[PDB]
């Protein structure tokens, strides 16, 4: 046995293209649409729960994941690749940051760590790149609210608002017309739901849409009282009912 693939499976072609990264981006393009919008007092990330069978319980599949109490992530592309990245991203937030500084990492630095993991799958021996693009939303005391995109190559960019996957080109044009620097969080959620309706074919409701925010601190979700400086997570996943309420005012 032994892993005898100690060599790179991603190489430069004569034209300077890294084939496997380009092909990973093609896999991302086929994936279901996800988006993110940044408001003055928050950030929203959203995607369609494309259920593979109606017998499947799509609540058990989480496309929007908590990484830290103040940072959340969504994806487009290969779901299993996303799941293992979320596991690795949660762990690296602790090992390379919280166990050292006693606090959760800021959004940009956790993104930096995820990016690093994705870069290494692009150069290390005997592996293919990750077939996902991530949208990571988060808050931290000194940088405030932020939204980042991370691609298969490991490259990352900050966004006011963006979309990835299937209908990203059309969605990004929709967001350009609606986005301004004076948006409140509710306005951004409203725009997120309007944008996502365009890319969805079938049912459009709280059970087929997954949507989460990075907003105010939720002391009700902390699980304990008695420490004034601990005020709770800023990440909150919206319920099926909370989505449907905002679909009547749509």
């Amino acid at each position: 046995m032994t892993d005898r693939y100690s060599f790179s499976l991603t190489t430069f072609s004569p034209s300077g293209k890294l084939g496997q990264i380009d092909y990973a981006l093609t896999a991302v393009k086929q994936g279901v649409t996800s988006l993110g919008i940044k408001a003055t007092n928050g950030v929203v990330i959203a995607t369609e729960k494309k259920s593979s069978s109606p017998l499947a319980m799509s609540e058990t599949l989480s496309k929007v994941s908590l990484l830290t109490p103040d940072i959340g992530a969504v994806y487009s592309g290969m779901g299993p690749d996303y799941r293992v990245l979320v596991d690795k991203s949660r762990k690296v937030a602790h090992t390379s940051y919280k166990r050292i500084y006693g606090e959760y990492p800021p959004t940009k630095l956790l993104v930096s760590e995820v990016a690093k993991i994705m870069q290494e799958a692009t150069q290390s021996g005997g592996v293919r790149p990750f077939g996902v693009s991530l949208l990571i939303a988060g808050h931290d005391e000194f940088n405030g609210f932020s939204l980042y995109q991370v691609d298969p190559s490991g490259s990352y960019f900050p966004w006011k608002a963006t979309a990835i996957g299937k209908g990203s080109v059309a969605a990004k044009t929709f967001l350009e017309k609606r986005w301004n620097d004076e948006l409140e969080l509710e306005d951004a959620i409203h725009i997120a739901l309007l944008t996502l309706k365009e890319s969805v074919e079938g049912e459009f409701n709280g059970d087929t849409i997954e949507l989460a925010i990075i907003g105010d601190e939720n002391p009700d979700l902390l699980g304990y009282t008695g420490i004034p400086t601990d005020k709770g997570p800023r990440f909150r996943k919206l319920t099926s009912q909370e989505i449907n309420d905002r679909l009547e005012a749509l």
């Binding site: 092909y23 990973a24 109606p54 058990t60 690749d81 293992v84 005997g126 293919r128």
Partner: protein, 241 residues
Amino acid sequence: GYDRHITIFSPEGRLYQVEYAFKATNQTNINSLAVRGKDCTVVISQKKVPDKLLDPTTVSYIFCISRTIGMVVNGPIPDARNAALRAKAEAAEFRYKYGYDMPCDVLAKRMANLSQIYTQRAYMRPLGVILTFVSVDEELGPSIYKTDPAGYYVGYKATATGPKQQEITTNLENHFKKSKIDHINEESWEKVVEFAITHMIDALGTEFSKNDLEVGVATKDKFFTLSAENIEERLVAIAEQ
């Protein structure tokens, strides 16, 4: 064209080895079904013993992973037993480290994560199997979680796997459209097994003897498989109404 031999991306963003592992899944020509009751989770699978020289008692694709978790496999037996031994090891290690029985959905995730690694690392091939895990979880109740060669998994109200999965899937879909509930509203597991067998008969259009089926039942704190005579009693009750 070496992008079809190992798990690297094709120009279309596809992993052909993963797709071909899905095709290996149906090599046994066996169909499985899983459903949830109020207090139980039932899994049934076709049993085919083509050779008279075989010991029919040793022919099985349903496995007892832990006391609480059962697993039915759709795919070749070597890969099935590979996945089984590993799942058993993982469930035992979990209990030792964390002090409680590994939940069905957590084991599914773990095995799915292992399957994901074979789709990303070149030296390891995917296993040509679909793993359906069943239990009565102490937190979530009756549970069906299924894993495939892509590393995908999800929970199910009910499910079906094999060459004729679509026929069984639609049959189950239509039933749950009528009842408007997420389970079989029945007290005893015996009647939930009778439901599972009846609806497989209707979907496949074939009759079954005691030796043509294989049944696994998950209740609170134990998963067990039925003997041929326990199945015979089940078949007699179906025929008498």
